[PDB]
Structure formats: C-alpha cells, structure tokens
Design a protein around this ligand. Structure first.
Ligand SMILES: Cc1cc([C@@]2(c3cccc(-c4cncc(Cl)c4)c3)COC(N)=N2)ccc1OC(F)F
Ligand code: NA
Ligand code: NA
Length: 379
C-alpha cells in the first residue's frame, strides 16, 4: 500500500495520441504497447499486419491461446474495427507480478482505428462490462485481474503532459504522485466511469446554468479522449465566457472551434490572459462538493507538427459534444486520478507532475456546500 516504485513512469505517449503501457500476451510472451483507456471495456489488439502497426498479436505462436469461436463487429463514426474473440495469458511487465487469463479481441480489419505514426498496437479498456462488446458477458481485463489474483480492486493514473509520460498504479496508490489530499466523487453508475458535475466556474465566475446541462446526457472520466469535451449548450456558454475573459488579445473565430491553430513566438505565450476553469464535482457527503481547477496549460494543447509555421502552435482543447461531458487528458493531466472501483468513487489530487507557471497551479479544494446535487444527473 502507498508505494509502488516498479510501476512509476510505466506510461509513455505522444501528445494527442494517448498514453500506453507495455503488456505481454500468450506463451511465450509477445510484447505489445497498449493504449490505457478508461472510456471503454475491451482488451482489443492488432492481430494482422496492418501497415501503421509496429507489431501485432500472432495467435499461432502462443501455446496458451484458446479460441472462443465468436466474432465481434464494432462500428463508430466514420469507421469500424472487426475481430475474433479468444483468451490468452496476459502480464504487465511494469505492473503487478501476476499473470491472468483474459479475453482478447484479435483485430483483423479496421478503418480509422489505429494511428499512422503512433507507437501503440492495441487498447486496454479499463471501464465496466456494461459497455463491453459484443455484450456485458465478455469479462473486461480488470475484472479478470481482480477475480484471479490478490490485486486490490483499484487503479490510479498520473498522466503527465508536455513525448509524454506517466504512471499507472495497478491495485493501489503511490503518495509520491500527488500533493495535498485526495477528494472523492461517487461513480454514479458502473458502465463508463460516470460522475456528476454540479457547478462550473470560469475564472471564478459561475456559468449559472441548470446543472443538468453539465451532465447531458452524461459526464465521464476518459483517459482515451484528448480533450475536455462539453455538451453543446455548456460549450457555447463556456467559450463565450472564455472569449470574454481573454479578449485582451483577439483570435480567429475558427480557433475556438478547433478549426485552426493559434501561434506565438517561443517563450512568449501569454498564459495570464487566459482564465482558470473549475469543475465542482459531487462529494461523498450529502450536500457536500469539491472543486478541481485547471489552467490554460491544460486546455491549450501544444501542436508540434506544423510545416505552415515555426512557432509555439496550440490547439484549443475544449470542444462540443453530443455524448456529454468527457474529462479527457486535458483534465486528467492536471491531477492524480484514483479509480477506486471497490468503493465506487473517483479520487482527485493535485498531480506532482502537472504543467504550470509561477503564478497559478492546478488545485483540488473542498468542501463546499451545494444543494440539489441529485437534480444535476440526467435520466
Ligand atoms: C469503438 C472504440 C473506441 C475507443 C476509443 C478510441 C479508439 C481508438 C483510438 C482512440 C484514441 C486516439 N487518439 C488519442 C486517444 Cl487519447 C485515443 C480512442 C474512442 O473513445 C475512447 N475512450 N477510446 C476504444 C475502444 C473502442 O472499441 C469498442 F470495444 F468499444
Ligand atoms: Na481477487
Ligand atoms: Na503526496
């Protein structure tokens, strides 16, 4: 408990392409880089020589593979993936010293799933069975891990922005990874890591919106989304408020829509003209909340690959949604986040690694008195 040195720094990444952990599958072990994804529930890996992939799962080479004789088809916006289900033996070299028999979806065909240039080959869905494909009877990796071992039923994530890095502590917490105290918000329902936002402030100013809007039709904590994604109505109000606070300088209207980038000479990015953003989350006690506070350092994402420019180019990392609020890396990079599955709660503390300046830092503060917090959830 409290200290897990062999798991510190076990995550890597490229900005905008998520964080991945090294895993092994089959016997003898095949090493793969696997995206850490708290927004889905399948362990799905490349299993055929797609051209974007550094490597792939070669089932024929594993003496421990078992076929489930079941296919899986997964469509989404603009694409799909398709695979074949089985089980095999899975370890995390920089995780707990255990090996488990887990469900693996061997991906045989995909469109717009893998990234050309990225260093990962599969996805570790860490969310719940309710959203597994094809159905909730396909046991997610973490459920198998807990059933089959003595690893405690929780994991925590320290994502460090910028090639990025971080830690995934499986089965516990490392106190060196955060400062101050952890504050907990209940997991509203075990499908996504669903939470309830009860209040939103920009630079200290309440958006004074019916709090149901903040959670229309859900809010989730998702390591596999880059951005903070806000429902349309909340996003409109959020930028309107952000536009106002930052009107000391002007930017194209398309910038706030993430349709163009914005650039400053190096060393000369004006952080101070930008407002802090505070989300108040439902607390553990009736009528009690806490708030988490992020900086422009979190919501203005560094974009390296621009041949049209030669400066500090940033994308605005806040965007509309029709699927609800999504607290992606933008949020998580500010905090140490504890996915306390045993107690159905998510903990937040200031991350010991988060990017800030000398004037402002990310914050986790409470308690606050907030009434009618149950009304904030959408049915
Ligand atoms: C349909 C589907 C989507 C996902 C998804 C995902 C897929 C592929 C790439 C990225 C990604 C790309 N670039 C930066 C990042 Cl940070 C992530 C994210 C979409 O949303 C989340 N959270 N993960 C995961 C598994 C799924 O399979 C099914 F089993 F549900
Ligand atoms: Na167990
Ligand atoms: Na600490």
């Amino acid at each position: 408990r409290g200290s897990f040195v062999e798991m510190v720094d076990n995550l890597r990444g490229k900005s905008g392409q998520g964080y991945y952990v090294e895993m092994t599958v089959g016997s003898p072990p095949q090493t793969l880089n696997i995206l850490v994804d708290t927004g889905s529930s399948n362990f799905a890996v490349g299993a055929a020589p797609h051209p974007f992939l550094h490597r792939y799962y070669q089932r024929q080479l594993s003496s421990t593979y078992r076929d489930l004789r079941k296919g899986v088809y997964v469509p989404y916006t603009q694409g799909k993936w398709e695979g074949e289900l089985g089980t095999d033996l899975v370890s995390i070299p920089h995780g707990p010293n255990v090996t488990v028999r887990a469900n693996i979806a061997a991906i045989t065909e995909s469109d717009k799933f893998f990234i050309n240039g990225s260093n990962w080959e599969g996805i570790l869905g860490l969310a719940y069975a309710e959203i597994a494909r094809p159905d909730d009877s396909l046991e997610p990796f973490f459920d198998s891990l807990v059933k089959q071992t003595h690893v405690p039923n929780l994991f925590s994530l320290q994502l460090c922005g910028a090639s990025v890095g971080g830690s995934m502590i499986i089965g516990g917490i490392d106190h060196s990874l955060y400062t101050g105290s952890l504050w907990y918000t209940p997991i509203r329902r075990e499908w996504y890591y669903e939470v309830i936002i009860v209040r939103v402030e920009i630079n200290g100013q309440d958006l004074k919106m019916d709090c149901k809007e903040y959670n229309y039709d859900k809010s989730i904590v998702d390591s596999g989304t880059t951005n903070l994604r806000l429902p349309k109505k909340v996003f409109e109000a959020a930028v309107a408020s952000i536009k106002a606070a930052s009107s000391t300088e002007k930017f194209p209207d398309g910038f706030w829509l993430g349709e163009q980038l914005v650039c400053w000479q190096a060393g000369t990015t004006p952080w101070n003209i930008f407002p802090v953003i505070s989300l108040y989350l439902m607390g553990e006690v009736t009528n009690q909340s806490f708030r988490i506070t992020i900086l422009p350092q979190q919501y203005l994402r560094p974009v390296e690959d621009v041949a049209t420019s030669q400066d500090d180019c940033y994308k605005f990392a806040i965007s509309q949604s029709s699927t609800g609020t999504v607290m992606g890396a933008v949020i998580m990079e500010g905090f140490y986040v504890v996915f306390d599955r045993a107690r159905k709660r998510i903990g937040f503390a200031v991350s010991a690694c988060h990017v800030h300046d000398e004037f402002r830092t990310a914050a986790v503060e409470g308690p606050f008195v907030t009434l009618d917090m149950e009304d904030c959830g959408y049915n």
